[PDB]
UniProtKB/Swiss-Prot annotation, chain C:
Changing residue 115 to W: Does not affect enzymatic activity. Homotetramer; disulfide-linked. Dimer of dimers. Belongs to the type-B carboxylesterase/lipase family. Changing residue 142 to V: In BCHED; allele J variant. This is Cholinesterase. It is found in: Secreted. Detected in blood plasma (at protein level). Present in most cells except erythrocytes. It comes from Homo sapiens (Human). It comes from the Eukaryota. Esterase with broad substrate specificity. Contributes to the inactivation of the neurotransmitter acetylcholine. Can degrade neurotoxic organophosphate esters. N-glycosylated. No other PTM detected. The major N-glycan structures are of the complex diantennary type with 1 and 2 N-acetylneuraminic acid molecules (Neu5Ac) making up approximately 33% and 47% of the total N-glycans, respectively. Only low amounts of fucosylated diantennary N-glycans are detected (approximately 2%). Triantennary N-glycans with or without fucose amount to approximately 13%, whereas 5% of the total N-glycans are of the oligomannosidic or hybrid type. Glycans are attached at residues 100, 126, 130-131.
Amino acid sequence: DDIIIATKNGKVRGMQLTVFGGTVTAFLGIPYAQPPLGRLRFKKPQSLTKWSDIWNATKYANSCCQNIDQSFPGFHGSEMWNPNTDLSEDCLYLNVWIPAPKPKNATVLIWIYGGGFQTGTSSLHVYDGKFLARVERVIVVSMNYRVGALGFLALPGNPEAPGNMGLFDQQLALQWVQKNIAAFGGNPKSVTLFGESAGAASVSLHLLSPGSHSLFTRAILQSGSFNAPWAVTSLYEARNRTLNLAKLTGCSRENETEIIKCLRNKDPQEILLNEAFVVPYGTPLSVNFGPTVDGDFLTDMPDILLELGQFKKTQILVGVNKDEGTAFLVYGAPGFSKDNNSIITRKEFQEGLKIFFPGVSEFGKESILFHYTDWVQRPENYREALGDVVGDYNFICPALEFTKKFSEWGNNAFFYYFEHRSSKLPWPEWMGVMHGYEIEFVFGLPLERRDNYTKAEEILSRSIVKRWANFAKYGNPQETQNNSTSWPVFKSTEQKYLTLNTESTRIMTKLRAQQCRFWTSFFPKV
Amino acid sequence: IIIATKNGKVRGMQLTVFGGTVTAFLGIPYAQPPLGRLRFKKPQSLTKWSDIWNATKYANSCCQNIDQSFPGFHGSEMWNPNTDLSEDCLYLNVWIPAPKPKNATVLIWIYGGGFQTGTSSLHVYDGKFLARVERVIVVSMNYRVGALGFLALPGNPEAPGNMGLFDQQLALQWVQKNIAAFGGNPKSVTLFGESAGAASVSLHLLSPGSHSLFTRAILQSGSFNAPWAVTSLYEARNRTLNLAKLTGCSRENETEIIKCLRNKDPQEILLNEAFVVPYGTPLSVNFGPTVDGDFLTDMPDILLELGQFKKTQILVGVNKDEGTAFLVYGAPGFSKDNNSIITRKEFQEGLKIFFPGVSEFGKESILFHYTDWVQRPENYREALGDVVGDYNFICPALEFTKKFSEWGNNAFFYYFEHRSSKLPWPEWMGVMHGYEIEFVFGLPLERRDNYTKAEEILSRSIVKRWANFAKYGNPQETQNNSTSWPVFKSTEQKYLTLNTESTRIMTKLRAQQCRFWTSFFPKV
Amino acid sequence: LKIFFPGVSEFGKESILFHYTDWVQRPENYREALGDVVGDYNFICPALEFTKKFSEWGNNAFFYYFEHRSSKLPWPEWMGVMHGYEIEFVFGLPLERRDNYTKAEEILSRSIVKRWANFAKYGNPQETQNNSTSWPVFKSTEQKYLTLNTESTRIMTKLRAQQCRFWTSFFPKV
Ligand SMILES: *[C@@H]1O[C@H](CO[C@@H]2O[C@@H](C)[C@@H](O)[C@@H](O)[C@@H]2O)[C@@H](O[C@@H]2O[C@H](CO)[C@@H](O)[C@H](O)[C@H]2NC(C)=O)[C@H](O)[C@H]1NC(C)=O
Ligand SMILES: *[C@@H]1O[C@H](CO[C@@H]2O[C@@H](C)[C@@H](O)[C@@H](O)[C@@H]2O)[C@@H](O[C@@H]2O[C@H](CO)[C@@H](O)[C@H](O)[C@H]2NC(C)=O)[C@H](O)[C@H]1NC(C)=O
Ligand SMILES: *[C@@H]1O[C@H](CO[C@@H]2O[C@@H](C)[C@@H](O)[C@@H](O)[C@@H]2O)[C@@H](O[C@@H]2O[C@H](CO)[C@@H](O)[C@H](O)[C@H]2NC(C)=O)[C@H](O)[C@H]1NC(C)=O
Ligand SMILES: *[C@@H]1O[C@H](CO[C@@H]2O[C@@H](C)[C@@H](O)[C@@H](O)[C@@H]2O)[C@@H](O[C@@H]2O[C@H](CO)[C@@H](O)[C@H](O)[C@H]2NC(C)=O)[C@H](O)[C@H]1NC(C)=O
Ligand SMILES: *[C@@H]1O[C@H](CO)[C@@H](O)[C@H](O)[C@H]1NC(C)=O
Ligand SMILES: *[C@@H]1O[C@H](CO)[C@@H](O)[C@H](O)[C@H]1NC(C)=O
Ligand SMILES: *[C@@H]1O[C@H](CO)[C@@H](O)[C@H](O)[C@H]1NC(C)=O
Ligand SMILES: *[C@@H]1O[C@H](CO)[C@@H](O)[C@H](O)[C@H]1NC(C)=O
Ligand SMILES: *[C@@H]1O[C@H](CO)[C@@H](O)[C@H](O)[C@H]1NC(C)=O
Ligand SMILES: *[C@@H]1O[C@H](CO)[C@@H](O)[C@H](O)[C@H]1NC(C)=O
Ligand SMILES: *[C@@H]1O[C@H](CO)[C@@H](O)[C@H](O)[C@H]1NC(C)=O
Ligand SMILES: [Cl-]
C-alpha cells in the first residue's frame, strides 16, 4: 500500500496521508479529459482515450491559465487565492480524497472553485478535501475547469467557440465521478455539488442544465447564484467581447471560424493580457468571459427557467457572509486601503458608486445613494454603506431571491447567514466577515489543532462540517447530537435562515428585506 | 393655574419643556396620613380640605432604608429617595401638558424597589417630558413600603397586609374621580411600573378591586410570579412575629402586638426589618405582598393559571442583563471597580448567597445547567449574572406573558438591550436592571444632556410606542418606517429587541434556560 | 443505583434518586422505585422514543403495554409482569390445553397471536371478529397505546410521560 484503483480509464496510484491520527488516501491530479490544446482550444472537453499502465496521482496538477492578483505582493490575504501550481493550457485534472479504510458506499462531495470564472484552482490549501474525508467519512472530489476567455469565449452556436467550455469541463468531471467513483467506494447515487462565488453560480447552473440533471443528487451554494448580476452574459456582449478580443490581437476577420483559427494560434499570455480590455469600462467585479445562453448547456435564459420551475427538483443549502462587499472595495474604491481604516466622504461614496456601477444612469446611482445613505453623525457611515451596496447587490440579494423562487416549486431549501470573522484573518477589522472567508470553516481547517484558530472556532467548524456532511448524506443540515439549534426549512412565506457564529446560532426571518426589495423590485428597472 | 378637585383646589406650576409649557401638580395628598393609630392600616379617605393646596414641590418619600454601599456614587445613589422620609407620604403627582388637553390618555407610574424602597420624586420618573412630547397626562404616587406597607398579620384588620398595594389602589381611585378635571380621560388609563412596580401592576390585573380603575398594563422587568414578589402566609407571620420579638413586642393578644409596634419609632422598625429572616440575599424582599384574601383573593399563580384576571392588552419586557446589578451586594469576587473575573469556587460561593435555603442538589443543578461552557476567563462571571437575571426576572417575566396571552389577549414583549453611554457602573454589568426607565421617560430627549444621537432617537421611538400602546393598545411606531411589533402568541413567542442599531423580531427568548427555571427548579 | 449506573456522576445519580423517590409511609416504595428506574431507563423509554421518532416520518406504528403476569411464573409476585415474559403468550404457548395456563390466559394468547398474525399479514394488528378493542395508530402527537391483559384491553395515552421526559430530555446530559 502502495494503493491502486482500477478506473474505467486505467490505474491510478494514490498516497496515504496522516490526518488527526488517521489515514486518508489522496488521488491528486487525475486527468478527466484530453488536454484541450491547439486544435482543441476553445472546444468542449474531449473524451479520455484509455491510458495503458499506472498513473501516479500524487501531486496536484497544473492550474489553468489565468491572470494573477498582484495588488498586494507578499500579502497572504490576497495571495492565498492565487494559483499554487504551474499555469498551463493543460489542466483538466481532478482530485479525490477517500477516507481510509476504503469505505463501502460513501456519499461524495464535489467542490467547484470560485473566482469570477476568471481565476481559481482546486489545489488551494483552503480546498483541501483531506479533512472532510477523515472526519465525516465522505469522498471529496474537486476538479479544475477552464476560466476566462479560454473557458468561456463565446461565439454563439459556432462549434469552434460555442461558449461555456469551462462549464462543460465541470460537467465532464461529474460524468467522471459518475462512471468511476464506485471503484473508490463512492456512491454515484448520493452526490452533492458544492461551490462558492462563481463556484456556487456554477452549481446553480447545473441545477438548470439538463445535461447535469442526473450527474448529482443535491446542491450547496455559498455566496453565489446564477441570477447574480455578474454571473451570466448576454449573447450580445458575449459577441462584442469575442470580437473586441479579436481586434485587440489583430484577429478580426470575415469567416468567423477564421477568427477562432487566428486566436487558436496566439500565445495564452497574449490572450490573458487583453481579456482585461474587452469591455468599455470595468469593475473590481467584472466577469469579462463567463457563462452564456449557449442553447446547449443553458437552453434558454436561466431567469426564465428559474421563474417557471425548469430545474432539477431536490434540496438545496444556500447562504452568504455578513460582509460580502468589503473585499472588493480595496481594488478601486477611492479612499479604501487595506491599511488605513478607510473612512470615506459622501463625495467619495458617490465616487465609489461610479466605480461599481459604470453604465448605470445618473438617476440609478442616485437611488442607490438615496436608499443606502439614510443614516440612523457616525464617521464610518459611508464606508459601511458602500460595502453593503456591493454586498447586497452582487451576492446577498440574488442569493436570497434564488432560494426564494427555488423553494416555490416545492423543494426543501435551507439558508445560512455566516457571520464569523476568522481570528487569523489577514485583512483589517473593518472588512469584517469577508467574501470567501467561510470556505476554510467548511473544509474544516480549524479542526487542525496546531493551527491557532480558537476553541470557539474549532467547535464552529466541527458543527458546520457536520451540518454540511449531513445535508450531503440525508438532505438535512441538522446537527442532531450536541443539543443544537434546529435548522428550519426556508419557506417563501416566512423566509427563515440560521445564523452561523461562535456564540449562539439563531433562527431569524427575512434577511435584508428592506434592501433586497430595492435590488430586486426597483433597480432592474433603472 | 388652579384645578377644582372633588377634594379641594390645587395650584400647579408651569415648567419649560423643549420650548413648551407643561403644568406640574407635585405633592397632591390622596389619602389621610397613616399615623400612630393608622399605622399598618388600609389607607383612609381624604376629608375634603378647605382652601387652596399649593402643589409645587415633590412630597415626603416614605420611610425606608437607604442603600449605602457606595457613598457618593451616582450609580447606586440615583435610586435613593430625594425628599424627607416620613410616615406622612401619601401624595401623588400629575403632569398635564399645556395647553390643558381635552381627553388625554393617562399613564400611572409605579416605582420599583423590592417593596422596600423607592419614591415617585426620582429624577428618572419625571413625567414632565412625556406630557410634553406625547401629550398625555402622567400620574405617579408614593405608597408605603417595607414593614410599614406590607406588615402582614393575616386577616387581622390591624395589620391586614398589602397596605402599600391598597395605597396604590387608592391612588387609582383618585385618578378615577379627579383626572377628568385636568382633562384626563378616566376611561383610557394605563398602569406602568418596573421591578416591584411591574409586579404591582401585575397584581392589579388580578385584584378585582382594581379591575375598573384602569384600562391597560405595562410591565418592565417584573411580575408577581417572580420568586421575590409574593410571600407565603406562613413567612408573612413568622416575620411579623420575628419583628415583634426583635423590638420586644411579643404578646398574647395579637392586636396587642400591633398596639406595641404602633408605638415604636419608624427607625427602630426600619432597623430590624433586615433581620426577620434567617438568612437573606441581595434580593430579599422581607415585607411584601401576601395572599390577604382582600386585595389578593387566592394564590395568584392559581388565578393566573385559570384565567382569573382583567382581560386586556399588556406590554411586557426585560433588559439584557437583569442579574449583574445585584452581584455587587454580596457575590464574592464582584466589585464595581475590578472587572470581577471569578473562579469556579467563587461561583459556587455566589450561588450560596442567592439561593440560601436551596438543597445541595438544587444548587448543583444550577451549577450544572449554567456552567456548560462553549477557556474564557469571564465565563463564571457572566454565568452567575444570567443565573440571577434568568431566575428572578427574565423567566417569570416570560412565563407570565405566556400564560396571560393564553386567555385570548394581545400581549407584546420586548428585550431591551442598550447600555446608556452615561452609565456610571462598569462595562461588565452591561444592560443593567432598571436602566431602561430613563429611556422610557424620555430623558435622552433633553439635548443639553449628553446622551448620543443614537440614544435620542431610540428614546423617541420607545416613548412613542409606549404612548401608542397606552392610547390604542398597540405599541407600533407607524411613521418612521419602523419594525412592526408582532403580538406575543403562546406558540411562536415572538418579541422585539430594543436598541440603537436595528430592532429585530425574534423568538423564544431564553428558551433553554427558562425550561430549567420553569419546569425543573420549582421541584428541587 | 451505584450498581446500575457505575460511571454516572454523583449528581447524575442524585437526579435519578430525586425524580423517582418523590413518594405518594409505604414499605415497598424504594423496592418498586428501583425497578422502574431500570425498567424505564433501559426499555420503556428508549422503546417509546423510537416509536415516536419513527412514526414522525409518516409510517403507521402501533404500541402495546403488556401487563399480564403468567400464573405459571416461577419468580415471586413482586417482580410482576417481567422482562421477557410475554414471549410465551406471543408464540401461543397458553393455547396448549394440557398446560395449565388459565382460560383467561388462553383467550389472551389467542388474541395476541391473531393481532400479531394480522399485523404480519396486513400491517394492522386488529382482532376483527370477537368484538375487540380497535388498536389505534400511534401518532407522535397523542401517543396512544393499547394495554394487553386478561380483563379489558384499554386505549391510553402518553405512556410514562413524566418519567421518560427525564430519561429522554434531561439524563443524556449528566
Ligand atoms: C463593444 O465594443 C465597442 C468597441 O470597444 C473598443 O474597442 C475594443 C477593441 C477595446 O479596446 C475597448 O477598450 C474599446 O472601448 C465599444 O465601443 C466603445 O465604447 C464606448 C461606446 O459606448 C465609447 O466611449 C468608445 O469610444 C468606443 N470605442 C471606440 C473607440 O469605438 C462598445 O462599448 C461595445 N458595444 C456595446 C454597446 O456593448
Ligand atoms: C487611506 O489610504 C488611501 C490609500 O493610499 C495608500 O495607502 C495609505 C496607507 C497611504 O500610505 C497612502 O499614501 C497610500 O497611497 C488614501 O488614498 C490616497 O489619497 C490621496 C488623496 O486624498 C491620493 O493622493 C492618493 O492617490 C490616494 N490613493 C488612492 C488610489 O486612492 C486615502 O487618502 C487614505 N485616507 C485616509 C484619510 O485615511
Ligand atoms: C421563622 O423564625 C425562626 C426564628 O427566627 C430567629 O429569630 C428571629 C427573631 C430573628 O432574629 C432571626 O434572625 C432568627 O433566625 C427561625 O428559626 C431560626 O432559623 C433556623 C431554623 O431553620 C435556625 O438555624 C436558627 O437557629 C433559628 N433561630 C433560633 C435561635 O430559633 C425559622 O427560620 C423561621 N421558621 C421557618 C421554618 O420559616
Ligand atoms: C476584586 O475586588 C474585590 C473587592 O475588594 C475591594 O475592591 C477592590 C478594588 C480592592 O481594592 C479590594 O481590596 C477591596 O476590598 C476583591 O474581593 C476581596 O478579596 C480578598 C480575598 O481574595 C478578601 O480579602 C476581601 O475581603 C474581598 N472582599 C470581598 C468582601 O469580597 C477581589 O479579590 C478582587 N478580585 C480580583 C482578583 O480582581
Ligand atoms: C510512481 O511513483 C511511486 C513513488 O513511490 C513509485 O513507487 C513508482 O516507481 C512510480 N512509477 C513510475 C516511475 O512512474
Ligand atoms: C450503494 O448504495 C445505494 C443506495 O443509495 C445502492 O442502491 C447501491 O447498490 C449500493 N452499492 C453498494 C452495495 O455498495
Ligand atoms: C459534540 O461535542 C463533542 C464534545 O462534547 C464532540 O466529541 C463531538 O465531535 C461533537 N459533535 C459534533 C457534530 O460537533
Ligand atoms: C401658594 O404658592 C404661590 C407661589 O407663587 C403663591 O402665589 C400663593 O400665595 C401661595 N399660597 C399660600 C401662601 O398658601
Ligand atoms: C373622552 O373620550 C371617551 C372615549 O374613550 C368618551 O367616551 C368621553 O365621553 C370623552 N369625554 C370628552 C368628550 O372629553
Ligand atoms: C421620525 O424621525 C423624524 C426625523 O426625521 C422626527 O422628526 C420624528 O420625531 C420621528 N418620529 C418618531 C416617532 O421617532
Ligand atoms: C373468537 O372467539 C371464539 C370463541 O367464541 C373462538 O372460536 C375464536 O378462535 C376467537 N377468535 C380469536 C381471533 O380470538
Ligand atoms: Cl447585519
